[PDB]
């Protein structure tokens, strides 16, 4: 099962501050440390800190300036880190991992892409992409759909929630005047289309959204 | 505090080749190095404990070497799973550090892009806009131009592009390009083409549709 | 002996960055570190102390890391009072040494001189000497030019100048040049002038006074 | 209170031979070592060498040309450099400081500046700069006061004794035919001068001197 | 004695897979480990693994793709080195050494040359190279003998069965489609030919032949 | 592991010459080096242990020395025996390593080839094939030029040589060129003559039999 | 072994200049260090051990200081009689070692020569030989030219020449240039003139004798 | 007293082999390490080997040539260095030291220099150089004396047996057709030739001669 828990993620303002949750699962010993990893987009793994919950004791990196403050319920199994007075320097995935005190981290969360932002948040607006009956075809048929005028990132896209991954295309989005957008490729064989079935999942953590969308021909 | 080195900071090889990453310590750190995988958008995933220490779900094509201060990443015949940053950790000294990372490319046979031009939808006029999408997809190398033309003349505003990494199904590259207008401006023209133009074909690849 | 190395010599910085002084040891030192800041005039006052650890007094702004052989002062933020040499020292084995040290500037917006010319007082008079100074405060960048006039002509006998370094109040300069005469000399002349030149008008700043 | 207390000055001839006091306060332990440090003009800092009071075993700097001996008297908290033959070389700021063996110097003196010379000792003149009744003004007026005809360095300066430090200016003395000279600004708004009183006061420690001087408007 | 005793060849196919073996006499101990060496033409010595008999515990260079497995016959004195899924890259002499367990090779095997091809074995062609009558003499005669169509490598060649040595060359083989060929050279003092009899003895391992061939004048 | 560095890569030296062979690792390993000859041919052969320490068999011209990182292996005197390949090997930590090896080479006095050439023999000719062999023997230094010639027309196909790396028994080359036709090609000319050319002379030295 | 290395191998320097001989070792070896003087044609003598302690005999203008891999012999103001070679030699591990040795050199005000002829001896023209000497003394710079002249023309056979190294007594130079025939050839002229060509003044100052 | 007493001198031929001497005087310990080292001409100081007499436990240096084998006669307080088969690469003086076991050498031999020749020792020539009569004069006059056709190397030449030192150049020897050759220097106010006597002394180790030379002026 996933050993951790993260919210996909977080918007926060210029001076303000989140607090990022880390739920473990699967075997706990009191010796087990919780470490925090800082990403920010295109570039590497940074070391944060590191927490002990069977106690409270945590460290952080001195390298960097400190936005951190580690805790964790040891009842809840969670972990948790308050970065506190961000500015968009600040905006990063930040994922969580365990390490049994052995020096490695065997397991990871997917992690909390955190935005600071004045802007707000949007839902995303999803549009098929069937295409047009003067369009020929081979024994292959692309499909696609349009994510558009959301806000923050990020948003995950499946085909037929999970049964659809041969075949798949996400584009990074690209942001324009506070809204970004994408979109996703799909292409089976012509004959399996319209017949059999397919659709494009959408989810946007930061407005808690989700939503199907069936991809038809034209009228 | 331990410095790790990781050079080259981009590998390319060639599909079934073996290939190296180093991993340079700033101090001699015993065997306590351990190695990583980020796939684009993925979280990391241990590959290689303690310098050369299996892990149960890796391939036998992954192993690692070394000690003291130098330590090599190796995979025996790279595939196109294996596109990704990898990256070298110490547990030698406190604070645990990371390497920079490694990006592994894969220098795979050339291949054209499969066009796909796509009208808006009606969902989408509905609300007041209109985006028309071409997808040039799974082609190699990287490098390749879209062009639009409306009703036979080149539009250059309210395009958006984005290209992805390349891709860890086949090592080919692909790219979306977007063209944006209000319903007004889609109404008053008729033939919308999106033209590719890619090394694999003197000729460009164009695709177009009609609203009327 | 351990040889401490502190780069760069000179570190210019934007107000409100973040700012970094290096400090390399000779051979491994644990944590033994301490750096010191030292303002114009001003004794040494120790930042921080073994490395990391703050001390009461300073200010939050100011943090240490390293271990081993390399080692970094950080303030987050710099500000006017930050414009010192900031110090390394090493205790971990005999005897303690210094680092050579780094000058921390802060580039700020420019500004103009703000001239003020003063006459030679009467107590001054009466030894039989005397001195007109003029003060050019409060500008930046440091570069700046001071020209005399007597009676509309020139002069460059009796002139000396001194400069202030960069102020902890403001980031600025400042600069006194001043005119030595006799009396006798100073009694058959009836205007001085001093003259500025810098960068922040075409137009020089001019300010004078007469006897008469 | 200040912890540790020096002299401002001392003039020294080629050849001749001084002794530096370093007294101090506070928290005194038995295991405290007094170090001095040398400071030549627009240059590092510099060990010289260390003592431990309690007892009189004194270490030196190695690198350099000996010139120190270092003593105490246990009796009236006191260490002594005596600083033997010097030469223009040996000119400078030293400093004392103390730390309590565990490495570092938490707390120096204020620190001694030598000077090596065959001249001699000239208190320093001073006199007002109040402006000229041709001159106009801001919000701001700037006076002054301009001391000359001394040696050897340093002499501090302040204004009102203290209580005027916002806008204050000392300039680097020149030296010119074994004399220095230098002026100090200080701007305060026009609307308290003349009525709030101002006044610059000027120490001289190699004669002993402190003279006051008002700055008033001219006759 | 010969301490260690290696087949002179092996041949094996791409993707195939050979078991070497390294047999010992003299002084055996139980604390003594049997290593193997790879050298690749024109290249150095590789460090392969290790194995120590008197347990069957072994360990391999960490720093190359594993093609090894050692293990022992204990009661033979063998040691053996299964190379498995061989390439071309695998082509090259193995030697195996001994090391009392104080960290250097003592002792050696002669090696074992392993190629790896497509192609079949072939042995060898000799034929004399006595001198034309038309060719003039000095107070030495050269004589020759010619080895060729042959496959895989090696080939050792003597002169009267290891009597004659001063005086012989043999020169490197050349491939082309498929087979190796070379020839050696002995120069005698001319008065000793033919009367003392001169012959050249060719051994070729990989088909397990060993041919003389008596090198007569020209009828 | 330990990286074994050697320098030079080759070594030319004259007959009688001391000569000396270095090996630097990349970490302090006491004495713990190890020295090996490789002739042309040969497996390797121990000849210093323990960086200095002879062994039996070994000429005393060999001798070791060095310890920590630089480790130096040297011959009194030089000669022909010497001609080989040298490695050295470390076994003060897991795994042993072995450096990259230094040839030496003897440079001698110059000297003329020895030149004979050879009929097919009638063994050969029987099986349907003719190889002429001439033998380019025990010449200084390396570089010669072989020339076939037929019936006084130079041939260019069919033929091939090989070098012999310098002799362990006089620091000489040698080299083998030989001539494959079919017996109908051989049948149909009457001359053949291998030419050969080398610095020692300007003319070349020819050798020719006819069949008839 | 432990490798030595004194820089620079010359050190020219002032009368009465403080002075630091440099002395880096190849590892760590505490303070075991000690540091030898050798003067023209003496043996050498003991002036630091263990890198700073005195001994008996030398003057307290020399100390040295230092420790690890960094040592420094000093000498404060230099004079005359340190003309020398100055070695560094370490007893930290086995085998002992020495530095290649730097050779001080003192920069004095410029002299002229003083020169003298000498005639042959009686003694020595008896045994049927006749040599003539000039000594070129006590001169700076270094550099300088001698020349013989028999009855006005200038000869260049059978002259030898020597240099004395800087002198300890006053950092000068000294040389002899020594004119050597048989009694036959020295009999058949009458003036002998050494000619010297120096810095110091436009004009040769020259020396001769004559026989009759 | 002289602690250390060693040989000026030793001739060898190609091949041949020599013993050099260093006995010992003052505090001897059986704690005691003699040390041998060579300085080739215009070169550096080279330690060859150290031996404890109290024992007869010797080392040499690896990293040369190994020349030598030492030894002592403990009853006589003697080292002996035997150099063997030696070449013109050998030839050098060679000092002997004495170091108390912990580290540095205290007290060193004069040396040993040994000259490795076919060539024969040859007694020195010496010579006056008193000024000709048409010579004018200072305040100081240079008188000096001639050493020639010698073989080998050293001499040393002294002025009144030690008592003139102040004032005195000897040169480096010149070779030529297989003898040294060289001049000395002395320069002594004019005021006290030839009243008071002036009297080079030379000492050729070599052929143990030793001859003193008045100057008086020329007849
Ligand atoms: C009894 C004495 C033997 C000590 C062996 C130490 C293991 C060393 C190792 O290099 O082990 C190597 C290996 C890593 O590859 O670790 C492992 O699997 C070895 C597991 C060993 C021990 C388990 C951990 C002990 C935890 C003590 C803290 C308890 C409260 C928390
Ligand atoms: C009982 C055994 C435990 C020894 C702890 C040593 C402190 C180490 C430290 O890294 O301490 C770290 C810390 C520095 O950050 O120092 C501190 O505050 C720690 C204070 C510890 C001890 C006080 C000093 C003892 C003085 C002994 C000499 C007495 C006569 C003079
Ligand atoms: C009793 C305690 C003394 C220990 C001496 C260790 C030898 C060190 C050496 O540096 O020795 C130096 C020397 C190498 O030059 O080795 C040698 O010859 C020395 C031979 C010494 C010991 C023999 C090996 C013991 C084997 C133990 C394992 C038994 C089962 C297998
Ligand atoms: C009782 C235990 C104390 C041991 C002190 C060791 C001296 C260390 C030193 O760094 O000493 C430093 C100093 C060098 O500067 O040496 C010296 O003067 C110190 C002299 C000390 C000892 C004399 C030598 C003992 C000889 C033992 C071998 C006897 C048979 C031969
Ligand atoms: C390899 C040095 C040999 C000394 C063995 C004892 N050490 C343990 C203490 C470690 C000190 C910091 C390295 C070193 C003690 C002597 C100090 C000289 C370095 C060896 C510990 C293993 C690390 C060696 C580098
Ligand atoms: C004997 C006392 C042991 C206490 C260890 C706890 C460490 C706390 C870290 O800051
Ligand atoms: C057992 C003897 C201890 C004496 C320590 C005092 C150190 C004096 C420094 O020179
Ligand atoms: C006390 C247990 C000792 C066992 C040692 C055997 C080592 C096996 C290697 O993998
Ligand atoms: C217990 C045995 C001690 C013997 C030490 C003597 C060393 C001899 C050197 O080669
Ligand atoms: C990816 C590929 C091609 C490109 N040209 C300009 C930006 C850019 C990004
Ligand atoms: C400070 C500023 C400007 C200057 N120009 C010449 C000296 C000098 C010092
Ligand atoms: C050895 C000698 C000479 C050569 N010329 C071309 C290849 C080659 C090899
Ligand atoms: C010393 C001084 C000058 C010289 N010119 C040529 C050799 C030589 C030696």
Known sequence: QVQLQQPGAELVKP??????????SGYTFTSDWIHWV???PGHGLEWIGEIIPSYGRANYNEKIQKKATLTADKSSSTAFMQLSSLTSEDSAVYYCARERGDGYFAVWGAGTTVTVSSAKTTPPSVYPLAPGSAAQTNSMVTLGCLVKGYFPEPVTVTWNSGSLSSGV???PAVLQSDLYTLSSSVTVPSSSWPSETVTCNVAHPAS????DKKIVPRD | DILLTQSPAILSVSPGERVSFSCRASQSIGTDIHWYQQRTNGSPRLLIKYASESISGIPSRFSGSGSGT????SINSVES??????????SNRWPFTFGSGTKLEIKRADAAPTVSIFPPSSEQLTSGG??????????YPKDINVKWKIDGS???NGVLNSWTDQDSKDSTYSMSSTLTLTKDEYERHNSYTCEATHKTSTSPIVKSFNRN
């Not at chain 2, 209109?130 to 082609?139: D, H, I, K, M």
Request: charged fraction near 20%.
């Open chain 2, 154 to 156: 080149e539009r250059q």
């Open chain 2, 81 to 90: 799973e294996d596109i990704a940053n990898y990256y070298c950790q110490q």
């Open chain 2, 70 to 73: 130098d330590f090599t990443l």
């Open chain 1, 15 to 24: 001076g303000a501050s989140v607090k990022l949750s880390c739920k473990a």
């Open chain 1, 38 to 40: 800082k990403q920010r």
């Open chain 1, 169 to 171: 295309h996400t584009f």
């Open chain 2, 130 to 139: 209109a985006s028309v999408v071409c997808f040039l997809n799974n082609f």
């Open chain 1, 208 to 211: 808690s959204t989700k939503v």
